[PDB]
Each structure stands twice: as C-alpha cells, then as structure tokens.
Amino acid sequence: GEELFTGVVPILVELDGDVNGHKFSVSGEGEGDATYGKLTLKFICTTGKLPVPWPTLVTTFVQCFSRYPDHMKQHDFFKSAMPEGYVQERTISFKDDGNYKTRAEVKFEGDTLVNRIELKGIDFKEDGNILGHKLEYNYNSHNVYITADKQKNGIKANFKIRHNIEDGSVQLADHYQQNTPIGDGPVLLPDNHYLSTQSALSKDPNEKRDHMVLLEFVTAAGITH
Numbered sequence: 001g002e003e004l005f006t007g008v009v010p011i012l013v014e015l016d017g018d019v020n021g022h023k024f025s026v027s028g029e030g031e032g033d034a035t036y037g038k039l040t041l042k043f044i045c046t047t048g049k050l051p052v053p054w055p056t057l058v059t060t061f062v063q064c065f066s067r068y069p070d071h072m073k074q075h076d077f078f079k080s081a082m083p084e085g086y087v088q089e090r091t092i093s094f095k096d097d098g099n100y101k102t103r104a105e106v107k108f109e110g111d112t113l114v115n116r117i118e119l120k121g122i123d124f125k126e127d128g129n130i131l132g133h134k135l136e137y138n139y140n141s142h143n144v145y146i147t148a149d150k151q152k153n154g155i156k157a158n159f160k161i162r163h164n165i166e167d168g169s170v171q172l173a174d175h176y177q178q179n180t181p182i183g184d185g186p187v188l189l190p191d192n193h194y195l196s197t198q199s200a201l202s203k204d205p206n207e208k209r210d211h212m213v214l215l216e217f218v219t220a221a222g223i224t225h
C-alpha cells in the first residue's frame with residue numbers, strides 16, 4: 001500500500017461545485033512525493049471565474065501524500081487503503097456564513113492518484129467574506145487532528161482553518177472529516193495523531209485562466225516514540 005508511494009506519483013484532481021447556485025468545475029494536475037510530504041498542484045477553473053475564493057477550496061483539493069515518519073508508519077490509514085482508495089467526506093462550516101459539504105473518492109487510476117470531488121455550498125451570505133471575495137490569497141499552517149473510527153473501519157478528523165480577511169480579521173472554517181475505505185482489504189486504524197500542514201499559494205505568470213498554484217508540505221506527528 002505504502003509501497004505505491006515510494007517515488008513521485010502523478011495526481012489529477014477534478015471537482016464539480018455548486019455554491020448558492022453558482023455552478024463551477026475545477027481541474028488540477030501535478031504530483032506528489034510522500035517521501036518528503038510534498039505536493040505540487042496547479043488548478044484551473046474550467047467554467048470561467050471561480051465564484052468562491054481559491055483559498056477556501058485548498059483542503060478539498062490527498063492525505064495519502066503525507067510524510068509518515070518511519071516510527072509512525074503503522075498509523076498511516078491513507079496509504080493502507082490504496083490502491084482501491086477511500087471516500088473522504090467533509091462538512092466545512094464557515095463561521096457566521098454558509099457551509100460546504102464535500103464527497104470525494106481518492107484512488108489510483110493506473111499509476112495516477114485521482115481525487116474526484118463533489119462540492120455543495122449552501123446558506124452563504126451574498127456579500128459575506130466568501131461570496132464577496134474578501135479573503136486574501138494566502139494560507140496559514142494548520143494541524144489536522146485524526147482519530148480512528150473502528151466501526152466504519154476508517155478515520156475521522158477535526159481541524160480549524162483560519163482564512164485571512166483583507167481587513168486584518170480572520171474567517172474561521174471548521175472542518176469535520178470522515179474517511180472510509182473503498183476496498184475490503186485490511187487498513188491501518190491509527191492512534192490519535194495529527195498532520196502538520198503548510199500550504200503556499202501562487203500564480204503562474206503565463207496563465208490567463210482563473211487558477212491556483214499550490215505547494216504543500218504535510219508531515220504526520222503527535223505520536224511518542
């Protein structure tokens with residue numbers, strides 16, 4: 001399972017979204033190298049202008065690329081579910097605003113790791129920080145706190161994303177996450193631990209389409225050795 005991740009793996013991301021009736025699609029391409037916890041992805045909005053801020057979709061757009069230190073490798077659910085993959089569902093609750101609900105399937109298609117996502121956003125304020133595009137194009141580091149869910153043979157996660165608002169305030173986005181294997185083979189059910197995530201957003205100077213370039217580093221931590 002983890003043997004599938006010893007080198008560079010091509011990644012494809014495909015999202016279909018509806019936020020307050022704004023219909024959009026995004027296509028992403030890049031690669032992951034779990035040895036270094038490293039993701040490089042470029043996303044393009046193929047329907048035109050993205051109707052929400054790019055940073056609000058970063059978490060939705062492959063935790064199998066996390067670097068699990070050797071001493072913690074028995075806690076890596078994500079790779080253990082491969083190649084058949086996992087379903088990842090989230091509720092992302094924007095404080096004093098709407099919510100996203102997402103359902104993704106993360107699995108190999110041949111030697112490529114694919115993240116296919118459906119996103120539904122409801123109850124957003126017309127000129128809140130999301131639909132009013134008041135969020136800065138940047139990102140703060142965070143931890144993803146993981147716990148086992150033995151009855152669904154899976155995991156749960158909970159974490160807080162803090163999106164910087166252009167006036168110096170912060171837009172909280174509470175994340176609740178559940179992952180379950182697609183296949184029936186055994187998976188690793190971890191002790192409590194977290195993923196330390198650092199994300200940097202940029203633009204391709206040669207790209208005229210609405211887009212996001214993401215560099216992310218993710219390292220598992222939190223288990224005593």
Ligand SMILES: [Mg+2]
Pocket residue numbers: 006035
């Ligand atoms: Mg290794």
Ligand SMILES: [Mg+2]
Pocket residue numbers: 191
């Ligand atoms: Mg134990």
